[PDB]
From a paper:
Here, we report the crystal structure of the [name]-like protein [name] of [name] in two different crystal forms at 1.95 and 2.3 Å resolution, respectively. [name] however contains another gene, [name] that shows less, but significant sequence identity (24%) to E. coli and [name] [name] suggesting that it belongs to the same sequence- and fold family as bona fide [name] enzymes. The [name] polypeptide chain folds into a three-domain structure with overall dimensions of the protein core of 43x48x70 Å. Manual inspection of crystal packing and analysis using the PISA server showed that [name] forms a dimer, with the subunits related by two-fold molecular symmetry.
The structure of [name] from [name] was determined in two different space groups, P21 and P3221, to 2.3 Å and 1.95 Å resolution, respectively, by a combination of experimental phasing using SeMet-substituted protein and molecular replacement. The three (P3221) or four (P21) polypeptide chains in the asymmetric units, corresponding to a solvent content of 48% or 31%, respectively, are well defined in the electron density maps, except for a few residues at the N- and C-termini and several disordered side chains at the protein surface. In addition, Gly220 in chain C (monoclinic crystal form), located in loop region at the protein surface, is not visible in the electron density map and was therefore not modeled. The final model of the asymmetric unit of the monoclinic crystals contains residues 1–494 (chain A), 2–496 (chain B), 3–219 and 221–494 (chain C), 1–493 (chain D), one sulfate ion and 249 water molecules. Noteworthy is also the absence of a bound metal ion in the P21 crystal form, which was obtained without the addition of MgCl2 to the crystallization liquor. The structures of [name] in the two crystal forms are very similar and result in r.m.s.d. values upon superimposition of Cα atoms in the range of 0.7–1.2 Å between the various subunits. In [name] crystals of space group P21, there are two such dimers in the asymmetric unit, whereas in space group P3221 crystals two subunits form a biological dimer within the asymmetric unit and the third subunit forms another dimer with a subunit related by the crystallographic two-fold axis.
Residue numbers in the entry:
A (entry chain B): 2 to 496
B (entry chain A): 1 to 493
The structure:
Amino acid sequence: NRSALDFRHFVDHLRRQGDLVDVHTEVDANLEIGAITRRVYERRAPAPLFHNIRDSLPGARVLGAPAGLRADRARAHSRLALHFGLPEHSGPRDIVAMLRAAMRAEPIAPRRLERGPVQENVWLGEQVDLTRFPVPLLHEQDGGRYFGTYGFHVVQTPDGSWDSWSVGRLMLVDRNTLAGPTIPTQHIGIIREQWRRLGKPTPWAMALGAPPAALAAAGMPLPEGVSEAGYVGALVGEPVEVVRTQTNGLWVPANTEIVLEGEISLDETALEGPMGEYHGYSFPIGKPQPLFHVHALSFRDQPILPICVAGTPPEENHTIWGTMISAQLLDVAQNAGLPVDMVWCSYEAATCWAVLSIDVQRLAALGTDAAAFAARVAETVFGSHAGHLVPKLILVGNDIDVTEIDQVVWALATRAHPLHDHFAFPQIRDFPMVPYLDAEDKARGSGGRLVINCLYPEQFAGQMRAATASFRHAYPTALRRRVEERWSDYGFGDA
Amino acid sequence: MNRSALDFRHFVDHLRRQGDLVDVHTEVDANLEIGAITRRVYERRAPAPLFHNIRDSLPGARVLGAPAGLRADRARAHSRLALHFGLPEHSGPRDIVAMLRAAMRAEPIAPRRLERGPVQENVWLGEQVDLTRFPVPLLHEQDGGRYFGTYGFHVVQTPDGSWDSWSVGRLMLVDRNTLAGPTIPTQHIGIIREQWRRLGKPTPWAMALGAPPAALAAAGMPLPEGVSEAGYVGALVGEPVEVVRTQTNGLWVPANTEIVLEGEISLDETALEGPMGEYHGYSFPIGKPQPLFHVHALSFRDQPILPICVAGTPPEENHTIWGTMISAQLLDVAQNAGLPVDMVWCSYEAATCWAVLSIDVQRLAALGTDAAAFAARVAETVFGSHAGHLVPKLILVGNDIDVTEIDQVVWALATRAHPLHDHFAFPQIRDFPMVPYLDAEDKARGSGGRLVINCLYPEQFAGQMRAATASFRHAYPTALRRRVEERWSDYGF
């Protein structure tokens, strides 16, 4: 709870539980930091807090892998769980039930403070130089250095009636200019347009090293006019504390490590990217994006710049956003009357697929078949904001545990018939970032969507052609419990 | 590792010696419990269990479960499996594959004939034969009977004695001295059965259980008709298997075999056999009539060990032995054909229902082909072989990934296989009949289950790649990777 609301306390928390390594060695923000953090995701090592970054502002720090996973199976997701207030042994299923709970908790208004820690140091106008920060070049093939890879943008509607928080990347352009994507169909883009329809640039701020739970809220889809900041309070049962910015009347979390302030240019662009992205790839060509002019910034003493070195799994895009998507999607399916009892975007599939666990008893009641169930499933799923982001759906019965990739592969290989179980929906619009889309797909706007059925035909009539020959399903309950409790007297200890 | 490879008893002491064997002294039940533990052993990837205290069974008789299952330790995960091919504990997929292919090219060594062997320490003749006295397990709840043979092979010899055969096979328990199990009509044992049947005679037979680890594996070699498995043990481990004559029918069986059965495969008698959980992870509900195997005598070692396979969800002996052996065969089929494949791997996790083919994209580009042509080509070549006949689905991916690691194959499949272009079905190529997802239309057509999934990006056929990979290995220069690994403890890890 104190970790969810305070990034610095979040860090001392990880240190306390031994999920942090303090790197005292001088490291280089040119590639080295990224290379270390990359190996950290892949080896599932403690999160590194880099204490000495070459040629940087003295005291400026960097936190790699803020939601990477741990090598400990029992505590694998403790870092990621900590962004939701959740404890060390929280698994996928614990975190989803927590997430669907939050999704129906009353939001709590952000507590307004006069003052805060992010205000300890202020740079105004000409005193602003972003290059003084340990700004990393995260992958050797990136088209520049990224100031923002672990924060959200803050913008407000012209009449001030509502706030938006949204995650995005920001490339370092120069000492007081950044640039990055701004999606028109989203709250930030929608609000830009409101200031455009007034002839004005958009007042902006970015929070970096914001409360872990504030980062989390900054990704949830919500109706226009609705503010993300109250859903921190829904998540953790406590309001996020905010202070107004120095410059532009926006509200930012009191204890953010670094806040940038300024405006998003109406017309100015810079060639932004490319960057190695969540899907595991680094495309070679960048595209123009709006300039972000930094007119002022402020930071806590010894500011920690958290980063995300995106790529092959598992990194924060899979761990944080994949997990949240799986919750929202589980909530979307149940709501519309679909026989789904769990959804997991396997980290190993880099958020390019979500697996749907199916209660085949409830499925039998629908009196339907694969093609029809597959079409109905696609519309519900892809017609939502979370499911717009995942191009492939796998429908499997609930005898397997869909958080286990090994079990999904078994079902995938043994149940999906080449002739009957491959349902393309090439007219459902794509999420453009999907790596396998070709030029025809992108010009058209669709072609990438697909549902893969692993639900045997007789399963729709509530039947099954064969029992699963596993420990769980091939032996009676009394025997299984006998073997479980007696396991260590057999001579196994811990298998 | 040839002493473990050529002697089951030594193989067992070895496993104990390394911490890969648990001696169960708790009294257990041959009814389901033995299998329930062993099933859990495969799945948790625990040390192999040696069962000493079995309810109402022959004293001194023990049981070994998970003979070739995996270990939870990632660096020695394949050690138990590797002992079967006489390999070191740190052996893995590619090491074992390269070992197999060399062995397929290696010359057989004639099995060494002994007059006596430990398998003769106990002999039961005729009415003394009571197969029920062994701790014969019921392995899964929905099984149609108890299984005596799930980790051993049949010995049959051609009527003129110019060659014999070793074939792995399941034998259900029928009564005192009768078993039943499938005789594949096209295999060496069905071929020979037919050879004796044209003489109006049943087929003299034996089964070796607790046979040398390399003998069991050699039974799965690709051999033309007229050639014997037994000499390919020597192909495998550089040493010949030692063999003695059976007590009653003049057949050759390995000398140190834990338990040997002797008798004949009936001409026309059947019993309803099965069902049983099989390699694919499922236990189908119906039993099928299968030939009788009259056991007229059996011999066994002092304190015999009966190895078992509790077949089902991966990874178990079907996947780790036969799966590993198939991948190697498929690597040969592909390379002998001209396909730009540097590795094939039948993912254990996929229960031998797929093989991931590692494509060399520099070599692919030279072909000047496309997805549809390549797919069809790889398909005729692979499914047209004896090994590839047994695998319904093939995945084609670039060799930038380890096709050996399932998490990388999954990444490749999710991010590179396109729903509209890369799903090439081959509905008219004969199926292997046991693939779990077929339907009655398929089984009556005899085909319809085959597929090649293509994860080669379209540009890879011209030699390009749309995007680099964002990982530790591929987003950073070698020099910097080296520094990070060198300074790893310096950073404070």
